[PDB]
Each structure stands twice: as C-alpha cells, then as structure tokens.
Paper text:
To gain a mechanistic understanding of the aminoacylation pathway for tRNALys3, we carried out cryo-EM studies of the h-LysRS–tRNALys3 complex in the presence of L-lysine and either a nonhydrolyzable ATP analog, α,β-methylene-adenosine 5′-triphosphate (AMPCPP), or AMP to mimic the pre- and post-hydrolysis states of LysRS–tRNALys3 complex, respectively. AMPCPP assumes a bent conformation in the LysRS active site, wherein the β- and γ-phosphate fold back toward the adenine base. Two magnesium ions were observed in the LysRS active site in the AMPCPP bound “undocked” state, coordinated by conserved residues E487 and E494, and play a key role in orienting the triphosphate moiety of ATP in the LysRS active site. This difference between the AMPCPP and AMP bound states of h-LysRS suggests that magnesium plays an active role in the first catalytic step of h-LysRS, ATP hydrolysis, and formation of the lysyl–adenylate intermediate but is not involved in the second step of catalysis. To understand why the non-hydrolyzable ATP analog, AMPCPP, prevented the complex from assuming the “docked” state, we overlayed the structures for the docked and undocked states of the LysRS–tRNALys3 complex. This comparison revealed that the β- and γ-phosphates of the ATP analog clash with the 3′-CCA end of tRNALys3 in the LysRS active site. Interestingly, H331 directly interacts with the β-phosphate of AMPCPP in the undocked state, and this same residue is involved in forming base-specific interactions with C75 of tRNALys3 in the docked state. Therefore, the docking of the 3′-CCA end of tRNALys3 cannot proceed until the lysyl–adenylate intermediate is formed and the cleaved pyrophosphate moiety is released from the active site.
Amino acids (aa) required for protein synthesis are delivered to the ribosome by aminoacylated or “charged” tRNAs, activated forms of tRNAs wherein the 3′-end is conjugated with a cognate aa by specialized enzymes called aminoacyl-tRNA synthetases (AARS). In most organisms, LysRS belongs to the class IIb subfamily of AARS and is evolutionarily and structurally related to aspartyl-tRNA synthetase (AspRS) and asparaginyl-tRNA synthetase (AsnRS). In contrast to its bacterial counterpart, h-LysRS has a 70 aa N-terminal domain (NTD) that facilitates tRNA binding, but the structural basis of its role in aminoacylation remains unresolved. Herein, using a series of high-resolution cryo-electron microscopy (cryo-EM) structures, we provide the mechanistic basis for recognition and aminoacylation of fully modified cellular tRNALys3 by human lysyl-tRNA synthetase (h-LysRS).
Numbering used by the authors:
A (entry chain A): 72 to 577
B (entry chain B): 72 to 576
The structure:
Amino acid sequence: DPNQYYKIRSQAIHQLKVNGEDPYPHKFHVDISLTDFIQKYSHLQPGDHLTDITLKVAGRIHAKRASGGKLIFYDLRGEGVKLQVMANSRNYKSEEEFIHINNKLRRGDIIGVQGNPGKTKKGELSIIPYEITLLSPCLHMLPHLHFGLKDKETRYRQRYLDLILNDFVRQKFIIRSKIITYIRSFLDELGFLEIETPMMNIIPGGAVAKPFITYHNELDMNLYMRIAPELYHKMLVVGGIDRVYEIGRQFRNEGIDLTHNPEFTTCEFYMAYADYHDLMEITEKMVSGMVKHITGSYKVTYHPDGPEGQAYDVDFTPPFRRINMVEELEKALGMKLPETNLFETEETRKILDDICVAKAVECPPPRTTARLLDKLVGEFLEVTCINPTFICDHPQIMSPLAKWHRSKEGLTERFELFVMKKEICNAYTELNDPMRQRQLFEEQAKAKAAGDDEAMFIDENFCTALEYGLPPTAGWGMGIDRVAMFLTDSNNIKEVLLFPAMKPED
Amino acid sequence: DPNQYYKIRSQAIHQLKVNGEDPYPHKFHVDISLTDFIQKYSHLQPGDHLTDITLKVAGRIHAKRASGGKLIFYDLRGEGVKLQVMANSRNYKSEEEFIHINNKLRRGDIIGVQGNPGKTKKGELSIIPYEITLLSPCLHMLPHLHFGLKDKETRYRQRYLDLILNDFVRQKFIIRSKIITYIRSFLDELGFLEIETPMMNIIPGGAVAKPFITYHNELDMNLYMRIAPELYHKMLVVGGIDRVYEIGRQFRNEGIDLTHNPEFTTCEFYMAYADYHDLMEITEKMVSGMVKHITGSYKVTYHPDGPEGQAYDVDFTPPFRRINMVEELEKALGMKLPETNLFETEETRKILDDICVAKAVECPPPRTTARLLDKLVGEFLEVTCINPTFICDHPQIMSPLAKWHRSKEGLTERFELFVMKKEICNAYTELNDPMRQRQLFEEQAKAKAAGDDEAMFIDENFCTALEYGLPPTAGWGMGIDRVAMFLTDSNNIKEVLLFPAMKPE
RNA sequence: GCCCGGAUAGCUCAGUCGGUAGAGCAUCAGACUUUUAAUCUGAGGGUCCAGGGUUCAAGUCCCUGUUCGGGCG
Ligand SMILES: Nc1ncnc2c1ncn2[C@@H]1O[C@H](COP(=O)(O)CP(=O)(O)OP(=O)(O)O)[C@@H](O)[C@H]1O
Ligand SMILES: Nc1ncnc2c1ncn2[C@@H]1O[C@H](COP(=O)(O)CP(=O)(O)OP(=O)(O)O)[C@@H](O)[C@H]1O
Ligand SMILES: N[C@@H](CCCC[NH3+])C(=O)O
Ligand SMILES: N[C@@H](CCCC[NH3+])C(=O)O
Ligand SMILES: [Mg+2]
Ligand SMILES: [Mg+2]
Ligand SMILES: [Mg+2]
Ligand SMILES: [Mg+2]
Ligand code: NA
C-alpha cells in the first residue's frame, strides 16, 4: 500500500534503532566528491577495476536495479552529477553483510559508499563498493517521475523535492548567486563601499507603496519595514562617503501574483559628482559584462510565454540603444504634443486623454496626465524594447526627488533600461535642494493623506541632512529578481526564489 | 545664534537663487579624486607651480581662513584626505570674481575647484584655483571645535555630522565592510553557495528569541520576522545543495542597550558530510585570516570599557585553545558536579541551585536547569577567555537542534568560539533524526504553552523535510556586529552601526 | 443562479449495447552476476459519488441529491 509506505518504513527504522543499528551515524569521512571522482576516473576503459584505489563518496540513491541476487546497481546523485554503484557480492566484505545492507536500502536514501573505481562492460563509470553505509533513510516514497516533477504546487511549497527531482533548479539558483556576486565585484572594483541600512523605519514615508507595520514593545511604538534604502544612502553621501551601494531586501504589503512578492532583493548605489548620463555607461558595462560572464555570450534566448511560446533573441552588445521619450513618442504617434513646460496644465492632460482614447489605451480611473502619458509610453514604446534600450528623459509628473532638466524644463533627469519590454534598471540625478525637497515631500504627504491630518509621511531627519549640503550626486537602482528571471529563462518570479510566499492552504 | 545663522544663510541662498546664480549646479566634472591628487602631485618641491596642468577636484570646506584681501586658504576635505585650496587674486580669473566668490563661501560648503596643482614655501600640497564653483551650500552652522563632537546622542542620531566631523567612523565602517567581504570570499573559495531565505515566516521559529509580528493585508495571515535562517538552510541541504551560506539580517523584539539592537546581521553556513570538529579548523582559518588581513597582524589590542580603560592584548595565532565545558568546569570548580550525562531529574536542578548558592552567583527567577548551568559556565569558565578559545561540548538541554554526542551521553556536538569573554561564532552537528526533532519541537511547544516567551513552535514542513532525509550536516553561525566591535576597538554596538535604533526622544 | 460532462483500485484510463469489475503506473514478494526508465513472474488494492425505480440480473437503462470541471450569469 503506497499510503502506508511511510509508516512501514518508520517501523523498519525503529527496529534498526532498537537492535543497535543506528541509521543516523554522526560522521562519514567523504574522501572525494562525485564531480571530482567523475573528472578523475572518466578515462577508464570499459571493464576496468582499480582494485588498488579505495575511495569514500556519499550521496542519495535515485535508482535501484537488481540484476541478480548478488548484483545490484544504485544511482548515487549529488552535486548535480550521477554516479553508478555496482554492489557485487564477490567484491563485498561478506555475503551476509551484502544481503543485510541490500535488504535495508530503498530509493531516496542517503548512503556513503567505500570502494574502488571502475567501469562496467557497457562503459559506465561506477564504484564497486567494499562497504555501503546507510546515513539517512528516506521515510517517504520518492516518485520515479520521468521528465521531472511538473506540478507547480509542490515545486514551490516543497523546494527540497523540486531540487531532488528537478536539476535545472540548482542551475537557476547558481545563476542568481553568480549575478549577485558579479554585481558586488563590479561595484567594489569601481571603488564603492557596501553598507547596511536599517530595515525598520520609524516613519513609513510619503510613498504610495503599502508598508509592513510592526510593533516594538520595549520602545512602545510601531515600526515600518523598508521600502527603499534611498534616504539613508543620501544621508551617508551627505556624510562624506561619495560612492555607496547596497544589495538588500525591500518589503511591500501588496498582493502576491506571478511577478510580485512581499519581499524582494534590489540593488541600489549612489555616487557623488555625477549624473544619469554618467551612469548610462556604467549601466552598459555592468549589464553587458554580466550577460557575457553568465551566459558566455552577448545573445540571450528568452521565452516570455513558457517553452511552448514565442522565443525572443535579445542582444546585449555594449552599445545599447538610447531614445528620448518626447522625440520617440512624437515619431511613434506621428502628431506633436504640447511643450513640456505646460505638462501640469489641464489642457495638456485633456489633449493627451483624447488621443489615448482615440488609441484605446485604457487607463486607471485617475485620469491625470501622468497615468495617460505612462500608459502611452508602455503601449507604444516598451513594445519595441526587446533588446536593451535606454529611455532617456521623463516628464517631472511621474518623477519626484529627481533634479530638473539641465536645458529642458518640466523634464526630470532620469533614464530607464528596458529589456524584453520590462524595466530592469533606473537611475536619477539627485535633488539636493532642501527647499524643493521639502516642498515635494509636503505635497506628496498631503497627496498620500488625501484629506487626512497629514503632518506625516515625511523625514525631518532627511530634510535636516540636506540642509547641511548634499553634493550633486546620482542614484541607480535595479531589480535583481527580474534580471535573474531574464537570465534563467523564467517567466515566473517564484522560479528564481528559493521559498516564494504562497497562499495558505485550506 | 545657530537659528540666526540658519536664517541668514537661507536668506542669502534665496537671494542668490533670485538673480540666477544657481547654488545647486546639475553637473560638475571631477577630473581627479583628492586621494589621487595627493598620490600623484606629491613629488613637487616647495614653491613649485604647475601652470600647465589644470585639474578639477571637489570637496567640502572644513576651514576657511584669510591672510589679506587677495589671499585666502580653504581646507578641502574629501575621502578622508585633506587638500589646501590656496586662492589668490593674481592667478584667479578676475579680482571681481575673486571677491564675489570669497564673500559667498563659508565653512561646510561643498565646492569644486578648477586649478593648477602646486606647493607653497611651507611645503604642503595646494591647488591654485582658476575658478571656484559652489556646488552645495551648508545652511546650518557646523560646530567648529577640536577633537570632533563627543555627544553620543548627536553622533548616533545624526550620523552625517559624525562622518563630517569625525574621521574614525569611516574607518570603522570600512573595516565592517571588509569583514563581510572577506567572509564571502572565504566561503566562496570553499565551494559554498550564497542563498536568500525569506525574512517573513508564517510561524515563529529558528532561534530562541521574541519575534516581530506583522500583518499581511491581501492574504489575511499574520507574518513573523526572521530570527534565523536555520530551518530553511537545512531544508535546502536536504534538497541537495551540500554547502550553503547566507549573511543576513535577524530581528528581535527585545530591549536596546550598548550590545543589543532590534535588527542585526549574522552569517550562517551549513555544510553536509561534516561534523562540529570539521568546522573548528575552518573557524580557526577564517578568524585568523580575517584578523591578519584587516589588522595586518595576529595581535589585537582591545579596550572593553573605553580607550581610557585597561587594554587587553589578544593574540589570534591559528592554534586556538580548546576547552571542554563540563570537564574543565569540574577541574576549575574543584568538586564533582552532578553527572548530568544521564541525569536530568529535579535532583540535578536542585543540586545545581545549591551550587549556585554556594558559589555566590545570581540566577534567573525561572531557576531552570539550563539557565542555572549557563550561569555556572559563564561565571566560572569565561574570565580567562581573552585570547580566542573553543568550547568542545555543551549539555543537550541547552541544545534543541544539535545531535547528541557520539560517545558521551547528555552532551551534544556543539562548540563555541569566545574572544574577549564574548562568543562570536558557534557551530552544531545538526540533528537529522525526524522523530527526535519532532520530540524536541513538542517539548519546546509545551514549554511555550507553560509560559516560556523564548520557546519556538512546531514546524511540520521542516519535519516533513527531515522525513525525506537529511545528510550528516554541520551548521555554523557568527555575529558580524560583535566581530566588528572587536576589530574596531569599539565597546558599543552603536559605533559599528550606521543608523542604530535609539529612543524616540 | 441555469445547462452540460465525469464521478471506477493509491494515481491515470477501459469497462464496449448489463452477463461484472479490467489495463498501465505506484507498493509488496520471487527469478536472474553487467543493468541504466532494467526485464519477466504474480499478489494485494474498488464496491463502482449517494439514494431510489426498470430489468432475471444494472457502474455499464432512467430520475433525484453531493462534488468537481466547462459553458451560460
Ligand atoms: N512585488 C515586487 N517584486 C519585485 N520587485 C518589485 C515588486 N514591487 C516593486 N518592485 C520593484 O519596483 C520596480 C518598479 O515597480 P514600482 O513602480 O516601484 C511598483 P509596481 O507598480 O508594483 O511595479 P511595476 O511598475 O513594475 O508594475 C521593479 O522593477 C522592482 O524593482
Ligand atoms: N539584539 C541583538 N543585537 C545584536 N546582536 C545580537 C542580538 N541578539 C543576538 N545577537 C547576536 O547573536 C549572536 C548570538 O546571540 P545569543 O547568544 O543567542 C544572545 P542570548 O545569549 O540569547 O542573550 P543575551 O545577549 O542577552 O545574553 C551573537 O553574535 C550576538 O551578539
Ligand atoms: N533610489 C533611486 C536613486 C535616485 C535618487 C534620486 N533622488 C533609484 O534607485 O532609482
Ligand atoms: N546560527 C545559529 C546556530 C548556529 C549553529 C547552527 N547549526 C545561532 O547563531 O544561534
Ligand atoms: Mg516605470
Ligand atoms: Mg527597477
Ligand atoms: Mg552561549
Ligand atoms: Mg553567535
Ligand atoms: Na509488473
């Protein structure tokens, strides 16, 4: 009965504990790794038996074929590689020990094997064991699922099962670790200093993202989880550390969907005496070098709609394409839009609304010019942003805390990097004017309150730091999870997360 | 006066903004950093003037002094280095520009200087400016005083002021970052894989502490802040990743003092097919390497009650000492303590309490066996732990996640590294038995129901993961903040934290 | 809420027009000293989603109820 298998196995294990045959030994001295074993002894001719070499490996059994009463084949699997184990009685310690150990071994059990390298008559590298030791029995029936596990409910809720049964998961996570390591090395070589900013803030801020509210009993007050390390990074830049960076975890009290998580890892750096046009080249170098170092080339194949969907071949050649929002939008829509200075005026908002309705671009119930123009951009600019593209200048109406344009007016100093019709990186030229910063904070706090008592959603510590002099600096941020999704060919954020947050059962 | 100065400076800046003359320019191309400026143009002899080189640097005006109406020395400050912008009328663009820019710049203002490197008669490197541009005025008055500011509240609440006025803070933070960089390099070269475990868990667990409770809105469940990534790391090792590690943040809902913070960073790794004696050599190598790579030697001087206090000279020579927590306690105390290897009855607790009374020590009001024996070991085996020292094994009752000792009973496979009488890292041989782990979880839950706020709950997902088979593993955890405190001669956790949590005053 | 189609061993499907529960996979036992998704030999495992009427006899004729899935709101 498959349902009672666990119980039966448990009983057997209990018996092994009763009669002094503890199936959980404290230590097994593994001499060589499976990868090193395979690399070293792959040259052996078929039929070889290195009787003069003794090695101790360890791994989980993934198969068990009984070709006879004295000849059994196991398939150790570990470190992403497999190794056959040719349990033969004539090469074992004794026949009784052989049958005793082989009567207690099942699939999924973690065992240690001591024996001699060799190759079968079919040219399969294996290890003839002098003695097999049981290290950790598997009490649950491990399925023999050909083509791997495919149910996307035990894959995410039981990540260990996904790792055991599916091999691409390990590669997906190794790629993410390599991505983070490459970013760290790049920024450190550039001269940056990695910092750790508080994840719990007294104030939530004026941002629209919903925060996570905790309660500190010792200090008898509420604590808000981090949304961005923005303000503390800028306070450090005020202090004197010109170049800072942090790869950290931000929290958001929003919904859980295909491409969202309550907690996510983002990279953010800030450098003094620069601007967004200076960060353009740094972003080009970082992204192109990361792609070259991870995938081994500048071309990446991505499937936005699963393996059966369309395949897109993006090219990360270092000269990324750069386009301005206003000019490219003029070229795409054909018609010219009113001048930027009149972006705040209502007639601009209405002429944008009329033309977007003419193009059937659905917008949220708030019909402010910001929503309309960002929808226009997303519907007629990101559509063509398959290869990485640099949107070069955005209007001030979506962008607070960013300096005004050097020559233009009403346009913020920002760029965005779009790969596969999705933004991965953004950067801004900082607003170091304490008066303008305070005015924006007040306005956004009043907007966030939306008729409430207000007098909050601000950081008087930050507005006091800026009054001490913040050098003209530039900030850059990027989503780690989206980059990992684009580099591991995953269209779901849960595929690049070890333990994604899932809805509770029942 | 500071309010008056702020009012006057703000009025002046507003008047400047009215008639053009933006005091916040968008871009200033810094050609060479200050450190490179000192490194390169230091071979000059006093009285040299490289009129054929023009460089644009930037910094903050720490001090502005004038010697005559046509000669004024500013003291630029940058990445921990000090320049000296010696500005004069003859080599400036114009005299009118000279006195128009001299009456506007004050202390603390961030400026950019485009000029020729040189050296005066006295012999300190300077830059003769052709044009000075104000980049960011400092509205408030920087407190001008020697030795920096000593007000701990001001330094901790306003870290930017501490960085501006005090230089050793930058050194402390550089050292703290180098610690984490070296740990990552050491673990990566050993084959470990860096991972990111969730910071919010449905049920509390991971380590003995009190958690932070949140409330997800869309999904109606109550989330809990992380205390340790231990369980997730062990499930990942079950999955097949032999070696994992993570340098992350843990949250405690407890008090704040000189050594405790609500959020703190710790490094945890787990390696399969290893025991707690396989991590002692690794720990020796990692700690000695960190000390030698940062300090430059194996000898470190530490002041535990302030620099004015006595200095203790610890030595990090790789052969660290090794001590047994029960055997050496027996040797030093004098008498035979209760056997406790197979005796966990109330008699053991009572005789422990009698020993505590006889030894003149203070014990927690719960007076339980674990707390007692913890007081006994801490007060009798820790005074002579100046140099780094290992603790071979600890009784099982203070070990709900460590495998039992292979030879002795009641003891567990658990060592602890102590430097300067404080634990930095501790490692376990992890318990891979599902039945024993379930039993220990049940005891912890029963203790919590009995009124133990520091007990964990039972996690059935981890129990199932163990039921699927966990290899013989060893786990290791280290407190980064305490190590940074030791390596920076800092006796307060606030000194090694960028923005420590303080009273809402 | 209305209509339609399934409710069958542990899982996936036959069971045809009733003459009765079968096949594969999963588990257990046996055979085989060179397998690789090893292969053969069997065993257990259901009570046919539930209750009624037709029929000598109905999972396999029909009517209700429960659930799931799809469409229609
Ligand atoms: N749930 C989530 N998971 C991961 N990253 C998230 C996230 N929510 C926000 N972000 C970050 O925010 C960036 C831009 O999104 P934001 O405008 O800040 C919030 P959003 O509106 O929910 O996302 P969207 O604009 O991508 O639709 C992303 O690239 C990512 O870095
Ligand atoms: N609130 C906190 N702030 C900073 N570091 C903390 C901390 N709580 C624990 N740590 C660190 O976590 C590591 C292990 O701490 P523990 O030994 O579990 C503390 P404890 O013994 O439970 O309580 P105690 O610190 O009040 O004696 C050490 O590096 C310690 O400094
Ligand atoms: N936090 C910002 C940096 C720019 C800040 C501009 N005031 C980002 O990641 O985009
Ligand atoms: N990381 C835990 C325990 C370390 C040993 C884990 N096997 C702690 O510091 O408390
Ligand atoms: Mg956007
Ligand atoms: Mg982004
Ligand atoms: Mg301790
Ligand atoms: Mg510790
Ligand atoms: Na069969």
